[PDB]
Amino acid sequence: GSHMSNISLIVGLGNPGSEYAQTRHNAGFWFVEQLADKYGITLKNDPKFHGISGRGNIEGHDVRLLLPMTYMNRSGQSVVPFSKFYQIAPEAILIAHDELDMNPGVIRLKTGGGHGGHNGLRDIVPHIGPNFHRLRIGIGHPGSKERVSGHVLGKAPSNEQSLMDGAIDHALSKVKLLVQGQVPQAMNQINAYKPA
Length: 196
Known about the structure:
Blueprint: E1 9-12, H1 27-39, E2 44-46, E3 51-58, E4 61-68, H2 76-85, E5 93-99, E6 107-111, H3 125-128, E7 133-138, H4 148-152, H5 158-172, H6 175-179, H7 183-191
Parallel strand pairs: 1-4, 1-5, 5-7
Antiparallel strand pairs: 2-3, 3-4, 6-7
Helix pairs in contact: 1-5
């Protein structure tokens, strides 16, 4: 299974299908797909766990990647059985997700806490508890609760996309620290990111 707070499972949240691939709610998929390409981890079909998943070496550590294919609000139907089957404790999990409460181009590593209204996290925390790590990828808030769907299921304008893409690229460079268990240092260096 997992060992301590070396990160050994990295989950990206999102919705399946070409119609959601470019939407803000898929920010976690963007991060994990880019990370898989960086390290040469194959993301392959994983019907048993209702997802796409992979396994490979990141900087000398055996790491699994998971993209639930459940739709966002059912993400726990993938993450929970997968993590349980591979005996990965929450403390060794990083979940990348869009964060309404942060600007595009802001990115933070957080340990613990609630779902913050995120419908994917809402499906995960009841089962495994809160003590996993999160890569909060800022996407902005549309104002009101009625607008949140249009916002997260929207395709960001180019300036916002650029800001998010730069923040995601920065975080990819800090995954080495995470898989080595250097959560405090990774937190400091991720959270310090500025776009400009």
